[PDB]
Paper text:
We have solved the crystal structures of two of the three isoforms of lysozyme purified from Pekin duck eggs (DEL-I and DEL-III). The duck egg lysozyme structures have the basic fold of the C-type lysozyme characteristic of HEL. In general, the duck isoforms contain approximately 20 amino-acid substitutions (of 129 positions) relative to the chicken enzyme, and were thus considered to be likely to maintain essentially the same fold.
These findings have been verified by our structures of DEL-I and DEL-III. DEL-I and DEL-II also bound HyHEL10 with a similar affinity, which represented at least a three orders-of-magnitude decrease compared with HEL. The only difference between TEL and DEL-I adjacent to the mutated surface of HyHEL10 is lysozyme position 101 (glycine in TEL, aspartate in DEL), although we predict that the aspartate side chain in DEL-I would not sterically preclude the binding of DEL-I to this HyHEL10 mutant.
Author numbering: 1 to 127
The structure:
C-alpha cells in the first residue's frame, strides 16, 4: 500500500505522532515522503546486510528482526515484516522508539537532508 499525503497525515495523527517528541505532523509526513515515497512495501538493502523496511525505512540491524541481518538486536520486538503492512500501527510504535533514541528525527537521513530546517506544514495543506 502506498499512502496519499493526506491519508497518511490522518493515520499518523490518529496514532499520536503530531508533536510527538516535539515533531509536528508535517515532519513525519515529510520524512515518509522522502524515506519511502509513502510506500509501506518499500525495502532498501544495505551493505552491512541490514535492510530498511516500510514507510519510515526502519533498519533491521537495530529495530526489527528480519531473520537474516547479522548481529541484529530487535529493539522494537517485531518481525520486520510487520513494517510492510498497510496498517502502520507497528511502524508508528517503532518510530516513537527511534525518535526517542537521543537524536530526534535525525535518525532518518532523508528527513535530515530534505525536511529539517524547511517549512513542513505544506505537507498537511488541504488535509
Ligand atoms: Cl505541521
Amino acid at each position: 500500500k502506498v499512502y496519499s499525503r493526506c491519508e497518511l497525515a490522518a493515520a499518523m495523527k490518529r496514532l499520536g505522532l503530531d508533536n510527538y517528541r516535539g515533531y509536528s505532523l508535517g515532519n513525519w509526513v515529510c520524512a515518509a515522503n522522502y524515506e519511502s515515497s509513502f510506500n509501506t512495501q518499500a525495502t532498501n538493502r544495505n551493505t552491512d546486510g541490514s535492510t530498511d523496511y516500510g514507510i519510515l525505512q526502519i533498519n533491521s540491524r537495530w529495530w526489527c528482526d528480519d531473520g537474516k541481518t547479522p548481529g541484529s538486536k530487535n529493539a522494537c520486538g517485531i518481525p520486520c515484516s510487520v513494517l510492510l503492512r498497510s496498517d502502520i500501527t507497528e511502524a508508528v510504535r517503532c518510530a516513537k522508539r527511534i525518535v526517542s533514541d537521543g537524536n530526534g528525527m535525525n535518525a532518518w537521513v532523508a528527513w535530515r537532508n530534505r525536511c529539517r530546517g524547511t517549512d513542513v506544514s505544506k505537507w498537511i495543506r488541504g488535509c
